[PDB]
Every structure is written in C-alpha cells, then in structure tokens.
Ligand binder design. Structure first.
Ligand SMILES: Cc1cc2nc3c(=O)[nH]c(=O)nc-3n(C[C@H](O)[C@H](O)[C@H](O)COP(=O)(O)O)c2cc1C
Ligand SMILES: Cc1cc2nc3c(=O)[nH]c(=O)nc-3n(C[C@H](O)[C@H](O)[C@H](O)COP(=O)(O)O)c2cc1C
Ligand SMILES: O=C(O)c1cccnc1
Ligand SMILES: O=C(O)c1cccnc1
Lengths: 216, 216
C-alpha cells in the first residue's frame, strides 16, 4: 500500500555501488519522469539520467568543493537524475506540446485544439508579462515532478535522495545547459542504500497536523 | 504497481459529489500531506482540508473571474486540499522543526542536534539573506509535496485534479492566511470522477523522451 511506502521511505545518505537497477527498473524510472503532470501540461523540463561511471562523475563535479560530501551519493548510486527546468517558455515549445496532444488524439475538432493552445498561451503570457515569475513557475512544475518521482521510486522498492546541495552553475556548464535553454534544480541519486546510510534506521520526523493542517 | 498508477491517473474534470472518501481514506490523505519530504525537512507549509459543504464553498470563492470553470470541481469533490506556503522563513519555525526532530528521537547527543540546527539555518539564511528567494524556495517544497500527493491519492484509488486556476488573493483573504503567515498556491479536489469527466477516457499525452531526456 502507498501509505506504508510514504512512511517507510527515507533520504538515503549512502549507497551500495554494487547494486544496480535492473534494465526494467531503469526503464520504469524514465517512465516516471516523463508522465508527471504539470500546469497546462507545459512539461517545462529536461532530465539528465546518468548511469555510467563517467556520466555520474560528470554530475558529481557539481558537488566538488563546498558540497564535496554529496559526491559519494552521486557516484555510488546506480542512476542519478538531474532535474532541469526551461529558462524561458518559448512559443515553439508551446506548439510542441499542443501538437503532441493533438497527435495523441486529445482533440475532437480543430476548434478544441485552438482553444487548448489559446488557454495555455494565456497563462504562459500571464506568468511572463504580468506576474514576472515564468522561471519560478516552470521550476515549480519541476519540483512537482521530483515529488512524484521520489514516491514512485520508493514504491518500486528503490532508495533515493533529493539533492539541492550542489552547484547548479557548475552542473549547467558541465552539460552546456544555459545555451540549450535549461538550468539544473535538483539531483536525485537512485539505487540501494549501504550499511553506511545512518538515516535508514532513524525514526522519521514531521511536525504534528495540529500545527500544519486546518480542517473545515 | 506504481507505474500502472502513474500511467492511469488523470486530472479529473468533473466529480461525483455522492462518492465520498471513506473515513480511513480521509485520514490517509492527511498522512500523505504530512509525510512529504522537503529541503532540510523545513516543511514550510500549511494545508486546508475542506470536507463540509460550507468549507468547500469558502474555497470555491476563489474560482472567480477567469477561473469560474473550476468552481464545480471545488464544490463537487469529496475533499478539497489547499496547499499553502509560508510567506517568510523565520527562526521560530526553524526551532520548531529541529525540536520536533529531537522529540522524535533523531539526535543521540546535544551536539548532533546543534549541528542539524546549524546546517538548516545555513541554507535558510542562504535563501532568505543572500539569494532573497526564500518565498520561491519554500513554494518549491510545497509543489514537491503536491507531486507526492497526486501520485499518492491515485495509489489509494482516488481521483483528483491539481488547480492553479484560482484567485489566491480571494482564497487568502477568505481564510485570513496572510496574517497567519501563509499564501495559497495549489488547490486539489479529491474524490471520485463522474461520467461527465471527459478527461477520464481521453488518452494521456506527453512529449517523447527523445526530446526531454538525455542518458549519459
Ligand atoms: C528538494 C530537496 C532538497 C534536499 N537536499 C538534500 C541534500 O542536498 N543533501 C541531503 O543529504 N539531503 C537532502 N534533502 C533531504 C531532506 O533533509 C529530507 O527529505 C527531510 O529531512 C525529510 O527526511 P526524509 O526524506 O527521509 O523523509 C532534500 C530534500 C528535498 C525535498
Ligand atoms: C500545478 C498544476 C496546476 C494545474 N491547474 C489546473 C486547473 O487550474 N484546471 C484544470 O482543469 N487542470 C489543471 N491542471 C491539470 C493539467 O492540465 C494536467 O496535469 C496536464 O494536462 C496533464 O494531464 P494529467 O494530469 O491528466 O496526466 C494543473 C496541473 C498542475 C500540475
Ligand atoms: O492546466 C490547466 O488547464 C490550467 C493551468 C493553470 C491555470 N488554468 C488552467
Ligand atoms: O536537507 C538537507 O540536508 C540539505 C538541503 C539543501 C542543501 N544541503 C542540505
């Protein structure tokens, strides 16, 4: 059951480098990344899935220095996912999205398609021209994807840990993301924890609902 | 199978108001909200769970103007969750979190607790005092919670729909959130879809991985 998963999952502090995802699990995590929902189905994201030792080493470069202690997590985990957000929502991407929805048969008429495109453009423009938060808006969708992902991999019986402790400037440069129109936000190593994972046996802690939740 | 859940869930466009969550399910969705992970376990959030007609009507006030299209969703679903983020990170909240972790038994010594507190303050200050993006940083954690929530409720066999199409100023004012230190970000009606939910039978659509995903 999913509640058991939510209560038993945890942020892995150390991974067993010998335990790799099966080809099936490797495919499944990519499915999770792709099918996450997003506002207007904008999917303002890009994912870098590092599974080779050299690939993970490249990602780990972002932890060199001040976040050096996050390097082992990025190197020992079987697969490491870098969640990136678009730096700007261009019309080409908007058309890409609506044309894909059309190709998938979500529109019964050309007017239905036009209405969908018009609505998506309306909110994209609102965030860009009036709220002046389009970058944050897209980053928010990426974080939602991350939330979906962490629970999903836990439900697959895999360990993982979300990471904000890295230098996005270094990671972006390493993969030339800026020129490509993206920026790294969260790094998530996935695999199996080792005996070195001190957080695997500690009790989980959250504020009481009497503080965080109001019922009406 | 969490992958089947991810592939089969959908944004519900119409709910059957007579199909209520069971008592246990009502508690389970609250558990999901509570146990979502967050950066430094900051849990910079508040949730409003509306299950009464009066409660849902109060939330539905936000479905005005360009958002009237979302009023029925907020009124017809069994339970409606309002995801809120703190408007500013303060030391009182930081102390609350570390003291809770201590009460739950995560620290073996006073030094361990102090180290955890210093680490959390280090990143909170980075956002609040240097980057000046603590409002966005906290909102991102709320969206991660939302992502975890949508997959979780789908795994419970419940329908839902995330909503950004609501007037947050209206919702904030109706619940006096500003003075309390919070602001509404996403509204999520939860329940069971009706035969009128046209999106329950439409194919899901996502961009292909050859565009959004790079393996290395
Ligand atoms: C977006 C995000 C960034 C985080 N960054 C890191 C990190 O850089 N290093 C680390 O050890 N844990 C990291 N964490 C893990 C948290 O400290 C954690 O989710 C929280 O203490 C709750 O514990 P749990 O995940 O085991 O339930 C992060 C969590 C999130 C959601
Ligand atoms: C943060 C967020 C805000 C959204 N807002 C609304 C909304 O206001 N009204 C609505 O009908 N759907 C809303 N959606 C639903 C999306 O259009 C949907 O997630 C996306 O098209 C993909 O479809 P799916 O959820 O069925 O997989 C939103 C989704 C997210 C993640
Ligand atoms: O995804 C949608 O349909 C949507 C998102 C934001 C605001 N209104 C509609
Ligand atoms: O949750 C943590 O431990 C954390 C979050 C951001 C950066 N460094 C550590």
């Amino acid at each position: 059951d999913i509640i058991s998963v939510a209560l038993k999952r945890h942020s892995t502090k150390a991974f067993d480098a010998s335990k790799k995802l099966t080809p099936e699990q490797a495919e499944q995590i990519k499915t999770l990344l792709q099918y996450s929902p997003s506002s207007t189905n904008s999917q303002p994201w890009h994912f870098i899935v590092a599974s080779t030792e050299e690939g993970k080493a490249r990602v780990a470069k972002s932890a060199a220095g001040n976040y050096v202690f996050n390097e082992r997590k990025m190197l020992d985990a079987s697969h490491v996912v870098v969640f990136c957000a678009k730096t700007a929502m261009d019309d080409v991407w908007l058309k890409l999205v609506v044309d894909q929805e059309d190709a998938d048969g979500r529109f019964a008429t050309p007017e239905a398609k036009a209405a969908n495109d018009k609505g998506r453009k309306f909110f994209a423009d609102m965030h860009r021209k009036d709220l002046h938060d389009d970058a944050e808006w897209m980053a928010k969708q990426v974080y939602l994807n991350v939330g979906n992902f962490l629970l999903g991999v836990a439900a697959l019986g895999l360990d993982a840990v979300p990471i904000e402790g890295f230098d996005a400037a270094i990671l972006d440069a390493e993969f030339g993301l800026k020129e490509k129109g993206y920026t790294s936000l969260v790094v998530v190593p996935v695999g199996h924890h080792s005996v070195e994972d001190f957080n695997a046996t500690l009790p989980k802690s959250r504020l009481p609902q009497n503080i965080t939740l109001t019922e009406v």
